[PDB]
Design a binder for this molecule. Structure first.
Ligand SMILES: N[C@@H](CCC(=O)N[C@@H](CS)C(=O)NCC(=O)O)C(=O)O
Ligand SMILES: N[C@@H](CCC(=O)N[C@@H](CS)C(=O)NCC(=O)O)C(=O)O
Lengths: 236, 236
DNA sequence: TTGAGGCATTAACATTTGTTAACGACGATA
DNA sequence: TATCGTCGTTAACAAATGTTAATGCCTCAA
């Protein structure tokens, strides 16, 4: 992306150099209250939350370039306690102090509008996801998540659309769709397989019937069409 | 609150005058995508979405002052096809075309930071809502919505906490929690009534065991503590 | 006073999902 | 080689939830 590159050159120009993170490494966490402005430049991360009981919840993934806020810009208080775990092998991200961000965006308006637009992307994303997950229950939740991962990490292959993700354990899918037990998600997956919707090959997932997921995730497909059209046309 | 008043005067200085809307009246709609930037100054509204089969989905409410984006500020494209129905008797809102917002914000930076902060409140809200509703299924979703309504529209009474909403039918809660049929909502509400959690009196809902809802909506309570701390202190 | 329609409560069945357990395939270690 | 853990299936049983129908309470219009 161009806006992302200009943003990079701006940050670096203002003495803000990137940091490197490895897999299983947290950029910020839900226990230390350090309000940051993460500009995930390269890599893949997952935003997670752990309850008092210890239950994990995968709220979303982030694939650079994108912006993640852990604190408000005016009050400089916390927007919510979450972790951002690196799940790719390596990732490069620009950690910015919450106070300096205001000084940086005040100076340049283009980059300001870039951050604003990434924010809108977050909003619309969350609304669509909430819709498609809420209506059709857990089957619809799984289907929606598969749609997201297929548009973001999917590549056409002889047998279908291969989702290029190193770790996609049943536990992870459950964490992304509010399912606590791997057996249940394994059952839903078994149904989808039997309906000739997906295949489990090479420890990976191959999506062969995209329309089936489109039915259970209308607002998500619509969203990718209205906000990530470059990512949407690669499969249409 | 106050930043919204300064924002009001700002809008009334650039020739952007408020428009009035009555109950059930829509400001923008899904089928006629004109990209606006609604600044709900006063009143209560609800953001809804209708599938192709007619299924309704209540994504959330909006009690002024707040900001709603129907289109992106850069691309000027729709962020998603949603409707905004007024559910209060009367509501005052400033309608702004999306192309004007970029200049109007470029002119003043404090109000830019206001809209930005409100958008961050939207983000945190959606994330917390997604986590709680998702973790404990439909019971937890009902508890979450009830907590939200209790913080935003609740007022302490000797009978508990009165949710000052005229129209809060079983079907409306269902739409707010992804439940299609009113009978199921009635069933859950009956369980809570038996559990000494709430009571249905004077055509309104009264909350007596806030903690019970806090258990099923931890991230939402956290959100009210972090994003709307006054609304949170009003009940603690 | 009557009748229609909408909303709430409940019951009864079907479908889905939660929860635990057993079995087998796989990798890794010694 | 054997042994231990982890993950994917499947089964069996319980709880939740989807779905429909019946009933009663209320308002409203004639
Ligand atoms: N950098 C890309 C992708 C940014 C990104 O990661 N967006 C989030 C939503 S705000 C996403 O697609 N997440 C995918 C997921 O949740 O797995 C863009 O500009 O849209
Ligand atoms: N103006 C009030 C309320 C703004 C508002 O409506 N915020 C949304 C969250 S983005 C909300 O609380 N919605 C409650 C609901 O969904 O009923 C404030 O800023 O605290």
């Amino acid at each position: 992306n161009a806006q992302a590159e200009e943003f990079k050159k701006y940050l670096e120009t203002n003495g803000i150099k990137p940091k490197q993170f490895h897999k299983k490494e947290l950029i910020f966490n839900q226990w230390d209250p350090q309000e940051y402005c993460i500009f995930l430049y390269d890599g893949i991360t997952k935003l997670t939350s752990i309850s008092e009981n210890g239950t994990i919840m995968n709220l979303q993934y982030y694939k650079g370039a994108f912006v993640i806020m852990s604190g408000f810009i005016d009050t400089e208080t916390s927007v919510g306690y979450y972790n951002l775990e690196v799940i790719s092998e390596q990732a490069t991200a620009y950690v910015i102090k919450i106070n300096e961000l205001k000084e940086l965006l005040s100076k340049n308006l283009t980059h300001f509008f870039y951050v604003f637009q990434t924010l809108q992307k977050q909003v619309s994303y969350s609304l669509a996801k909430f819709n498609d997950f809420s209506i059709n229950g857990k089957l619809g939740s799984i289907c929606g998540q598969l749609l997201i991962l297929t548009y973001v990490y999917g590549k056409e292959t002889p047998d279908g659309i291969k989702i290029t993700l190193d770790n996609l354990t049943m536990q992870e899918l459950g964490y992304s769709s509010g399912i606590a037990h791997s057996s249940a998600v394994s059952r839903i997956i078994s149904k989808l397989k039997q309906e000739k919707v997906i295949v489990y090959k090479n420890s990976c997932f191959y999506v062969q019937n995209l329309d089936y997921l489109k039915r259970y995730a209308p607002k998500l497909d619509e969203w990718f069409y209205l906000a990530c059209p470059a990512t949407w046309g690669k499969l249409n």
